[PDB]
Amino acid sequence: PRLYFENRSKFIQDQKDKGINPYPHKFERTISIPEFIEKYKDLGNGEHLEDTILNITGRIMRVSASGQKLRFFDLVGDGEKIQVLANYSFHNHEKGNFAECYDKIRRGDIVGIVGFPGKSKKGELSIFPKETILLSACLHMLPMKYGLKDTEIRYRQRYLDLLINESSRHTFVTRTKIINFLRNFLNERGFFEVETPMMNLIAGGANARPFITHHNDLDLDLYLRIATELPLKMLIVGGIDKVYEIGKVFRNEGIDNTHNPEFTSCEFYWAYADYNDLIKWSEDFFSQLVYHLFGTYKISYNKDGPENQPIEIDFTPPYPKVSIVEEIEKVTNTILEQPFDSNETIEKMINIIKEHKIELPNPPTAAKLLDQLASHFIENKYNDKPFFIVEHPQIMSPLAKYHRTKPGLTERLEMFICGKEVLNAYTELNDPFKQKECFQLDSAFCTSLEYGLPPTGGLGLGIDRITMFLTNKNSIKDVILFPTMRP
Amino acid sequence: PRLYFENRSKFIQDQKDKGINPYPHKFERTISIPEFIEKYKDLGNGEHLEDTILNITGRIMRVSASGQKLRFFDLVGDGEKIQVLANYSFHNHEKGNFAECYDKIRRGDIVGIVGFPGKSKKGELSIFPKETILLSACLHMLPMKYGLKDTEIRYRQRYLDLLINESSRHTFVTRTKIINFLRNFLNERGFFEVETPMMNLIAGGAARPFITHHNDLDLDLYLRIATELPLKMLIVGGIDKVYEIGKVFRNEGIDNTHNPEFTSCEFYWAYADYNDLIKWSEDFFSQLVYHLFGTYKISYNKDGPENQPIEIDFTPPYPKVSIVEEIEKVTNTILEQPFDSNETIEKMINIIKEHKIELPNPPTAAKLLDQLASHFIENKYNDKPFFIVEHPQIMSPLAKYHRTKPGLTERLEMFICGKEVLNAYTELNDPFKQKECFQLDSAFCTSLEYGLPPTGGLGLGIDRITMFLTNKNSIKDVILFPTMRP
Ligand SMILES: NCCCC[C@H](N)C(=O)NS(=O)(=O)OC[C@H]1O[C@@H](n2cnc3c(N)ncnc32)[C@H](O)[C@@H]1O
Numbered sequence: 001p002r003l004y005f006e007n008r009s010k011f012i013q014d015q016k017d018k019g020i021n022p023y024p025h026k027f028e029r030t031i032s033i034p035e036f037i038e039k040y041k042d043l044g045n046g047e048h049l050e051d052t053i054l055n056i057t058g059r060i061m062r063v064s065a066s067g068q069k070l071r072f073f074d075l076v077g078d079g080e081k082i083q084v085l086a087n088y089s090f091h092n093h094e095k096g097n098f099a100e101c102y103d104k105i106r107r108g109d110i111v112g113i114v115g116f117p118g119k120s121k122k123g124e125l126s127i128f129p130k131e132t133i134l135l136s137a138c139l140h141m142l143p144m145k146y147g148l149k150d151t152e153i154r155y156r157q158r159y160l161d162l163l164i165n166e167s168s169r170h171t172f173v174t175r176t177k178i179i180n181f182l183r184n185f186l187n188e189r190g191f192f193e194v195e196t197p198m199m200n201l202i203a204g205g206a207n208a209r210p211f212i213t214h215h216n217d218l219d220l221d222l223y224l225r226i227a228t229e230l231p232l233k234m235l236i237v238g239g240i241d242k243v244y245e246i247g248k249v250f251r252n253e254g255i256d257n258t259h260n261p262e263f264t265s266c267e268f269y270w271a272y273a274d275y276n277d278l279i280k281w282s283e284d285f286f287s288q289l290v291y292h293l294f295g296t297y298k299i300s301y302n303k304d305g306p307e308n309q310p311i312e313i314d315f316t317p318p319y320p321k322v323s324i325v326e327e328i329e330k331v332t333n334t335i336l337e338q339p340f341d342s343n344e345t346i347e348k349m350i351n352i353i354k355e356h357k358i359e360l361p362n363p364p365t366a367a368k369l370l371d372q373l374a375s376h377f378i379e380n381k382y383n384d385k386p387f388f389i390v391e392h393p394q395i396m397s398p399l400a401k402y403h404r405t406k407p408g409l410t411e412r413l414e415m416f417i418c419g420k421e422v423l424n425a426y427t428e429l430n431d432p433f434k435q436k437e438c439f440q441l442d443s444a445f446c447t448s449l450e451y452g453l454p455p456t457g458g459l460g461l462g463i464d465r466i467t468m469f470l471t472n473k474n475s476i477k478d479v480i481l482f483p484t485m486r487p
Numbered sequence: 488p489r490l491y492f493e494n495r496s497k498f499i500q501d502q503k504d505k506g507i508n509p510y511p512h513k514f515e516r517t518i519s520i521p522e523f524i525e526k527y528k529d530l531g532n533g534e535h536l537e538d539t540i541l542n543i544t545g546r547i548m549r550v551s552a553s554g555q556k557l558r559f560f561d562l563v564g565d566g567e568k569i570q571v572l573a574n575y576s577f578h579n580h581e582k583g584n585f586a587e588c589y590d591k592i593r594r595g596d597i598v599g600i601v602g603f604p605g606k607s608k609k610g611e612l613s614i615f616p617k618e619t620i621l622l623s624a625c626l627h628m629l630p631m632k633y634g635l636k637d638t639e640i641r642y643r644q645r646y647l648d649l650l651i652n653e654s655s656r657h658t659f660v661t662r663t664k665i666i667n668f669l670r671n672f673l674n675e676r677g678f679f680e681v682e683t684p685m686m687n688l689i690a691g692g693a694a695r696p697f698i699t700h701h702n703d704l705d706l707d708l709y710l711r712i713a714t715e716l717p718l719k720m721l722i723v724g725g726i727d728k729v730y731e732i733g734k735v736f737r738n739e740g741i742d743n744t745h746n747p748e749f750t751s752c753e754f755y756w757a758y759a760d761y762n763d764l765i766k767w768s769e770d771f772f773s774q775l776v777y778h779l780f781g782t783y784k785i786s787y788n789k790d791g792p793e794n795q796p797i798e799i800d801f802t803p804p805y806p807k808v809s810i811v812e813e814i815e816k817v818t819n820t821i822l823e824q825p826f827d828s829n830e831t832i833e834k835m836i837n838i839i840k841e842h843k844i845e846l847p848n849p850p851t852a853a854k855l856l857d858q859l860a861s862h863f864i865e866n867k868y869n870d871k872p873f874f875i876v877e878h879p880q881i882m883s884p885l886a887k888y889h890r891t892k893p894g895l896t897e898r899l900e901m902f903i904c905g906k907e908v909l910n911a912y913t914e915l916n917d918p919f920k921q922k923e924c925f926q927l928d929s930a931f932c933t934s935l936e937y938g939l940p941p942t943g944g945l946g947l948g949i950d951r952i953t954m955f956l957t958n959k960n961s962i963k964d965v966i967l968f969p970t971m972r973p
């Protein structure tokens with residue numbers, strides 16, 4: 001109970017009162033636990049290297065019952081494990097009673113050890129101490145091997161999740177491996193990474209309620225970025241022809257499984273590229289990244305929870321392209337004539353929505369009805385492959401350049417994986433006269449457009465959702481180390 | 488005037504009325520201007536390769552036609568330039584009048600060229616067009632180099648600065664190279680990059696905060712002032728070498744080593760102490776400078792490019808100066824502990840008054856000690872970087888107590904020309920000794936109660952390091968879009 005904490009705390013003072021330092025300043029270890037496993041895993045059973053003295057550190061995770069002369073522990077570090085085998089005959093009795101010194105050790109204690117490497121008779125690789133020193137004590141009782149499935153402890157105290165549940169470490173290692181692979185993928189193709197402001201006087205290139213915060217001395221209100229699209233395109237104007245940013249953005253809406261207040265986005269802008277360049281980019285990149293992580297283009301994913309049978313997602317390129325308006329017009333068996341915000345085709349969409357018992361949009365704007373219609377009739381089209389929804393109407397894509405053969409449409413693409421969007425890209429609108437809100441946009445961006453934005457293609461990736469799919473998670477809370485929670 | 492803009496706009500609409508697209512969608516180029524220069528730079532003077540046909544794009548930066556059949560242009564991309572030599576005799580009259588088509592071009596227009604490589608008789612590397620298309624017009628007059636030394640246009644329209652001042656490009660390339668070098672340097676050493684949250688409930692981990700309201704939780708959050716706390720929690724969780732490079736926020740005054748957001752890199756290194764962190768700083772700064780410059784000694788105009796430069800040598804080791812001992816030596820006073828006693832407080836206020844230092848208005852001991860070091864120590868060395876070390880425990884509430892000198896901590900701070908670029912220490916890991924767990928929050932404190940190994944942490948100021956390494960004396964010159972008033 002809380003008695004355990006009280007008792008370990010008082011134990012700590014007792015050691016201080018005997019002039020022992022239960023938190024020493026520095027311990028020079030010679031080798032990591034992984035390095036140890038690598039160098040000594042091929043020893044023979046019962047074999048010892050009793051003249052090779054090592055200093056090693058780790059956390060005690062298992063304490064097995066005292067024999068008269070032998071003590072056994074599990075020691076872990078960097079997500080790996082060796083055994084401690086403390087034998088009375090090898091103990092340097094000059095530095096204290098064997099029994100009392102190893103009786104102090106508790107599960108969760110961090111120790112440093114002076115000893116030699118060797119194996120059990122049974123063959124277990126272990127370090128044989130001569131001396132072990134407490135280095136930092138764990139004052140509470142740690143959960144047991146499978147005792148930590150309570151989500152709240154894993155998110156409000158992720159150090160425990162990282163210590164107990166083997167998988168979580170792999171999940172965040174895989175997250176970093178993905179961001180590394182993305183950085184080096186853009187870097188090898190001549191792209192140039194930059195940092196643009198988190199605070200501005202306007203929210204950027206999407207639609208979302210912002211976070212407001214007050215700069216005091218300047219007595220102004222600033223808004224957290226909802227995207228990076230605008231300053232990065234300005235940098236394209238400045239002749240940084242391949243540019244990207246990997247960092248946080250903020251959107252002040254509701255938490256769910258695919259949506260967190262702050263999330264990690266990566267945007268890139270690519271001068272003289274277009275829609276088709278970006279299609280191939282996405283095919284290239286997801287296929288290579290999956291193959292880089294798994295040795296295959298096929299992975300398995302628990303779309304409907306770990307309680308249910310998973311599905312196979314195949315990242316083999318090319319992926320399918322589905323035209324949003326045409327495909328809605330084909331599934332619904334109706335025809336939507338432009339303008340899409342006609343009174344008549346707005347009412348046609350609203351009748352599709354009422355007839356299929358689909359919820360209707362808070363304001364029934366054409367863009368929001370088309371969005372809802374795609375959400376119900378397309379976005380779960382393919383669940384065994386990523387696919388692209390393409391050629392969105394101009395009324396849904398205020399910064400996408402107009403389609404070069406299909407009037408009213410844009411050269412835009414979104415990629416979906418199990419029906420959740422991971423990717424948003426288009427041929428960038430670069431005619432300042434056609435960006436008709438220059439008469440969530442600001443004059444600095446629009447003015448920059450008048451200096452000549454070359455024909456460019458831009459892409460934005462949801463890093464969190466991609467990580468979810470590649471680490472078999474159903475909630476964004478499992479790929480963010482410190483998800484934000486209600487108290 | 489603005490008349491130039493109005494006329495360029497009319498020109499655009501007139502091309503559109505004549506069925507010409509002045510913003511085509513896609514131009515498929517064969518080669519970049521850098522690749523062009525690298526590939527044809529050793530052609531002979533006056534030589535041509537008119538049977539190898541290239542597509543290339545760029546920004547037209549010079550438009551000095553001369554002759555009614557020869558037109559000369561400057562073309563830049565990716566920071567490099569070639570000449571465009573448009574000769575009537577190579578023009579494809581089938582795609583439009585030569586003169587008519589080339590009269591349209593203006594300084595700033597982005598264009599695509601179909602042509603062949605060669606050198607002029609003078610030897611100027613050039614693309615020779617058969618066809619030139621407008622891809623995106625520059626509707627404004629571009630300023631020339633002289634025109635852009637106004638600080639405000641460089642900060643308010645950095646695309647201009649990046650187009651006109653080739654200094655600027657180099658600066659920002661250098662900042663990215665610095666961050667690359669740092670990421671690679673940590674990764675090679677076993678370090679694990681993570682992201683920890685930008686908004687927290689606690690004000691921060693190390694100044695006033697930015698407040699903001701989270702709507703879906705009816706809550707107020709604070710932008711992080713440092714990454715120290717969650718990263719130490721990752722050490723508790725067994726990520727024994729961890730780091731983060733991102734923005735932190737400080738709601739304070741704008742001065743040219745101080746911006747509301749700036750880029751920090753903090754790492755935590757389990758089983759390392761103060762000494763490991765000194766050695767790390769020496770290795771990193773020496774190797775980084777050598778990586779960028781092929782030497783350890785750099786020039787830097789501390790007072791601007793108008794005054795004389797000074798030399799900084801980064802060859803290791805750097806000097807270590809112990810703060811209180813040094814203040815005591817210069818002031819010829821003895822500040823004995825506790826440093827917040829009335830007695831020593833008035834010694835320090837007497838020194839401030841006697842030397843006419845401004846007094847820190849909440850005159851705490853920590854503030855005073857800080858003001859004293861800033862006045863007597865912090866610009867001791869300006870020819871070499873140096874460390875101020877062993878700060879009093881009262882200035883360092885998360886630094887582990889000095890293992891031999893009572894009342895001090897195992898902390899270090901590195902200064903270059905008297906501005907601090909990193910702050911590091913042996914970490915305080917005894918929960919009982921962090922005497923607020925009864926700036927900090929309960930989450931961090933409890934996590935200390937689960938066992939923080941002996942650890943050493945370090946924080947770097949990325950912007951300031953870049954300032955010194957790109958010869959700037961203002962932070963706004965190393966930040967692409969510094970915040971200004973409208
Ligand atoms: N120039 C073309 C588009 C540029 C990027 C543009 N700013 C944009 O599309 N942003 S976006 O639609 O928000 O897409 C960002 C991606 O990030 C992900 N995303 C978006 N909102 C969230 C939220 N709320 N949580 C998590 N992930 C999110 C998802 O993958 C999106 O496709």
Ligand SMILES: NCCCC[C@H](N)C(=O)NS(=O)(=O)OC[C@H]1O[C@@H](n2cnc3c(N)ncnc32)[C@H](O)[C@@H]1O
Binds near residue numbers: 909912
């Ligand atoms: N456990 C060790 C401490 C970790 C780092 C500690 N959190 C810290 O010192 N944070 S910091 O004070 O913000 O310092 C980080 C560095 O950032 C730089 N810095 C600090 N404030 C600013 C401001 N405002 N602008 C620019 N650069 C700044 C300076 O180089 C500092 O040494």
